[model samples]
Target: DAASDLKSRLDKVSSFHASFTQKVTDVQEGQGDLWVKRPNLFNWHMTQPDESILVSDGKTLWFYNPFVEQATATWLKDATGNTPFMLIARNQSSDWQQYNIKQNGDDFVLTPKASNGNLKQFTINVGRDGTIHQFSAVEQDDQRSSYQLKSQQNGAVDAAKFTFTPPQGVTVDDQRK
Candidate 1:
């Protein structure tokens, strides 16, 4: 029932744009902007703690860091493994079925049925308005990243924002193989 509720809530949102504050357990705290569209499109731009961008245009995934002046691209299909963002943007039943979900009120905690080396588990809280309120995930290394979404707006987001082009003087590494 939690899975159905989660799916229905996410299904109603075609796109969303939010500002997020991130905390990495005893490591660092950063602020960023996030955008997501249905069927696997996302953009994560971190402006604090250093500038970086991660975008997925449904086909390719790109990661760029302005400080390092290097950008890396990978196939989106290969890069979607264990990322909680997919849980929000994907509508497929197969995807939600992979996780064992427990819910208490608006909060849902999900653990993958398979023990993947990537994500240990993740939790998300659905806001009263049906947007994601907060997200947190633990990795294999025991590092946890928690994000609090502020000013979340759901509905049509600019499609262009999901596409990334490395700027001048930036090295591009295309690793699709």
Candidate 2:
């Protein structure tokens, strides 16, 4: 049953599109839509109606926000663990050991390992088909960000759709950190 459930979910997962609301305590809060194509490209739009694409061409990572007039670029090694953004962008099984997984009702809750000191704990509510329904992350600073995705659609995504170009008049910031 577990294998079948996993397979069913995998089969339905080619690309995913969703709109989300993000709240960062005492910092910034924004609403955005996200597009993710497995094993690489994704984009997050924050505080803007337009798409801010983040892509990894199996090497470097690119972040471009047209509304902000800024394109931030960095390497993949410098981007990991900064967010759940990479969860679907890369194969994540290697990092599973960094969290403790337990069943909470019909969901799976993941608590960070002690080594991940910045994170207090987090919970991921997954459907029976293994697709995430909701996620809540709490940091050591007590700041929390919860995401509820809606209108999730899955299918093949055009490769060209992931290719992003910086808009005119936008400054490219090399955010290697």
Residues 1-177 of candidate 1: C-alpha lDDT, one tens digit per residue: 888887777777778898989999939999999899988899889999999898889999899988989999999888665566656656567777777899998898988798555888889888545788898888888899999987788888999989988889999998988
Q: Report residue 74 deviation for candidate 2 (angstroms).
A: 0.8
- Candidate 2's C-alpha runs over 4 A off are 1-12, 26-29, 47-53, 116-118, 175-177
Local distance difference test scores for all models: 0.83, 0.62
* Predicted structure with the largest TM-score when compared to the true one: 1
- Candidate 1, lDDT over the whole model: 0.83
> Candidate 2 on 20-100: residue-level lDDT in tens?
776666265667766677665666556443456666654567787776788877887767655666654443555445666
What clash pairs does model 1 have?
none
Candidate 2: TM-score?
Answer: 0.75
